Design a protein around this ligand. Structure first.
Ligand code: SF4
Ligand code: SF4
Lengths: 535, 532
């Protein structure tokens, strides 16, 4: 009566539906042998370095077709809002810049994640983690990417690792003699929008599940640069298994799963509820960051088995920096997924913004902004003072010790961002905004001390920021989230380090910008352009 | 220059600190060979079946020393409350029964989880998941365990798989030629108390982190049968990595990690903050289920690297059914962690309630006492949990009456393990009450569920319901499923929905069934102070 049933039964387990390119000459890294009557493959571990290096280079300059098609859909759909089309056009133009292979598509070049599946008879010498890490190290060291990993010297003392290591290296033991991979360059903002819910059987009916989906999708907000690939996993054998599944679902790794369950508890994709997720996302009005229909590119819904007493649920997104790449090593060499190298083909063949001069007293800038309602698009020209999470924490710590808010926090709008490395001969590397919500706890304090009256970042913010701006006559401006390469190429004209150089990308910078687009998200009157869609 | 640094650098990666017994004759399943100048191991895959079968049999009848030592500490501590000692004594006596190898220590024999680490040159034939699953199937089929896995035929239509499969099989590729394992029989209740938080740099200071810990520990409540092994993971490279780490930390799998960080971002255990967690747990007053000092056995705190923009945080517990077993296969055969087979060495006022009356008489008697009163129940209980409640709500939504069996007796939220031959009942302890909270006001408004019996603190809607309708919630001790079956449960009958397996509605006759009045008919809740 025993019947083994693997939980995951893809019809395309080796991803034949994906197009791959062979690394030229790479068959020299492999050798077919036979031991004890079984076919095995000897792999020079240098192949893992070569592969990881190319993967974490390619993925920062090109996108998959299904991602690019989503931006085109947002441009061509009559039901898309004007802001939907504007945002998607900006992201497509950014992708065209990134395809130049100099600037990465986002300043957050992400955490390096490797899902590896090493066959029983695939023999590497066993030092896979080191050789993969050397390839990741190469990609981030010798290209214009960013070192984003923060080491803990103790519970609270931190430093940047300076090389974007350590990677997340999940190497699985599987049948056969090949080595198969999914590489992910996972941005922090979308990683933060991976949520775990501990639910019950009471959720598992159509009315409760739809209400749940409507409630939770809003908590994603715009803080991870939509349009999103939305992934929803219902059930699972443990919290960690649910969350791993929702990550992989968001990378479209489970697209070939069956679409029906069985009495053995196999996983399945649920197209009916994917359509419902898309309807909820579209009808939400949240839109592609600034109101409209294109909150989501597409949706993936996986139903999993569960312990009778349990119902873990996972919700996660892939952001505008949608970065994954499949690969495999076999008897013919190294193969790597082919991404779209001509994103410009997705762009169409075919008095809308307020010019804001920042080279004025900051009180003059506040006065001009006060004339306009939330949702007004502005174009910024002048100096921004750049500071995000660690710089804000350090400045608050100084003030807690009796020191004043530094003067450089009062002269210019505060841009929450951390730049990638500067290409030779460029004024700036990729330099888009970080998530605004992480700085929310500092706004009222800083404004009470005469600074941070105007902030510039991306994402909806908490009510304390709306209240602070109303109390102190402040504003929060929402940059487009994601278009870091076109901002650097076209808008950022000069970058200088002003304070805290030891923080790396998290130092305080003074930058000069031109034609920098943003929306007035929070005004000085209690208004918030997300108050209706994210209520 | 490039310097590779593994995130996890245990000083005891092969768990030499654990004692193992070799399965007799198991050297016949392995053969050491030498291929292209390197040492390799041929493993007959039947070894995986034998090993998984023994692991998921042993683990339901014995515990680790550090778990048992915690129960003794709660009994012997002068600062423990009377309820601390009562619960810990009950759990130890339950372990003594489970050590007889007939009744499992808990009715929830858990989800079968396998963490496997197969060396590059360990050759099994590659069908590891099937052979491991067959061993798990054997353990749950041929022993007095429970089938707890619920398959989704579609998004909402469900059925029990009838064999406790599928298992969670996480098989990793590692260096060498051995095969190393951690087997976990993970209860649903403690699995439900694995939480993920998305935090920021604003958390990473002593004042904010301590307040955060105090806040989140309370949300564990008593719903996963404390004393807890509490695990806290600060940071991580992804949510799933943070949650896998906190699971393993709760199994004491990472006990040998370094205790200092470095500029390469290595993981470390933080003993200073483990002590702070234990201090918060003790000062909370939550206690071993019913108030006191022994909310927690011990604590593990692991600090992980993080993306600059991110700070995932994981919190998870191991419950009273603390069930994990390390194992490895090498050139000498199959080795399995030795658990404590003589738990008895760790061992050193109530109101009689007759249920064989009209339920209004039982409600009247219970109304005479405050919350915190210990009661002993004698008579019929009607047993129903998650799916049965959902089916009954659906019936009433379709105009049908609340069934008679929800109106005659206290409702025991439980699902039994299989009955041993010649026994009146298999292991039969309570399930978590909170999952049924959304039904209480509805059912009471329709004349039933006035008295419920389970374990764990409940939400305010249940307190309001019991005050509005004159109801009560009784808290059984959580965990002691074998001694409850041996001593209290005299007759078991399937009443309705037999297709639900353990989740069917049961009618059972009990004697000397202990419980506390947790919620009364007046708005009181014995957790209102500690879990506010
Ligand atoms: S800034 Fe936006 S697009 Fe870039 S990694 Fe973060 S969430 Fe993704
Ligand atoms: S009933 Fe309690 S002891 Fe048993 S598995 Fe659930 S939480 Fe653990």
């Amino acid at each position: 009566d025993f019947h083994f049933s693997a939980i995951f039964q893809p019809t395309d387990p080796h991803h034949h539906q994906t197009e791959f390119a062979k690394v030229e000459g790479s068959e020299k890294y492999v050798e077919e042998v036979e031991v004890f009557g079984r076919q095995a493959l000897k792999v020079n571990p240098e192949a893992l370095t070569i592969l990881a290096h190319r993967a974490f280079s390619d993925v920062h300059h090109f996108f998959r077709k299904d991602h690019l098609e989503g931006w085109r859909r947002a441009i061509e759909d009559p039901e898309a809002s004007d802001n939907d089309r504007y945002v998607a056009t900006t992201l497509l133009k950014n992708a065209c810049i990134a395809a130049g292979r100099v600037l990465p598509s986002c300043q957050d070049t992400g955490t390096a994640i490797v899902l590896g599946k090493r066959g029983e008879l695939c023999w590497t010498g066993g030092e896979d983690e080191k050789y993969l890490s050397k390839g990741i190290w190469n990609a981030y060291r010798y290209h214009n990417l960013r070192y984003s990993q923060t080491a803990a010297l103790d519970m609270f003392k931190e430093c940047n690792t300076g090389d974007n290591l350590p990677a997340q290296l999940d190497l699985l033991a599987v049948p056969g003699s090949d080595y198969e991979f999914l590489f992910i360059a996972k941005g922090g903002g979308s990683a933060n929008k991976a949520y775990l819910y501990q639910e019950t059987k009471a959720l598992l009916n159509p009315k409760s599940l739809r209400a749940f989906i409507e409630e939770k999708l809003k908590t994603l907000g715009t803080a991870a640069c939509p349009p999103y690939h939305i992934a929803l996993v219902i059930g699972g054998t443990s919290a960690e298994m649910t969350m791993k599944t929702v990550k992989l679902a968001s990378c479209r790794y489970y697209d070939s799963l069956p679409t029906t369950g069985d009495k053995y508890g196999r996983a399945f994709r649920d197209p009916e509820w994917e359509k419902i997720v898309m309807e909820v996302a579209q009808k939400s009005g949240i839109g592609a960051q600034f109101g409209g229909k294109y909150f989501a590119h597409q949706a993936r819904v996986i139903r999993l088995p569960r312990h009778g007493a349990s119902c873990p649920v996972g919700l996660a997104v892939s952001c505008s920096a949608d970065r994954q790449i499949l690969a495999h090593i076999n008897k013919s060499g190294i193969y790597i997924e082919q991404l779209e190298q001509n994103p410009a083909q997705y762009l169409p063949d075919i008095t809308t913004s307020v010019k804001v001069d920042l080279k004025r007293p900051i009180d003059k800038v506040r006065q001009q902004l006060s004339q306009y309602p939330v949702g007004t698009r502005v174009m910024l020209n002048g100096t921004l003072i750049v500071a995000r999470d660690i710089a804000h924490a350090k400045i608050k710590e100084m003030m807690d010790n009796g020191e004043p808010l530094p003067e450089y926090m009062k002269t210019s709008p505060i841009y929450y961002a951390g730049p990638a490395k500067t290409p030779e001969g460029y004024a700036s590397g990729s330099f888009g905004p970080t998530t605004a919500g992480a700085m929310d706890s500092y706004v009222d304090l800083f404004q009470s001390h005469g600074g941070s009256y105007i902030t510039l970042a991306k994402g909806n913010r908490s009510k304390q920021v709306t209240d602070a701006c109303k109390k102190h006559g402040g504003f929060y401006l929402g940059s487009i989230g994601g278009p870091a390469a076109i901002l650097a190429k076209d808008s950022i004209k000069q970058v200088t380090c002003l304070a805290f150089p030891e923080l790396g990308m998290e130092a305080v910078w003074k930058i000069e910008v031109e034609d920098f687009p943003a929306f007035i998200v929070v005004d000085d009157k209690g208004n918030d352009m997300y108050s209706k869609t994210l209520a």
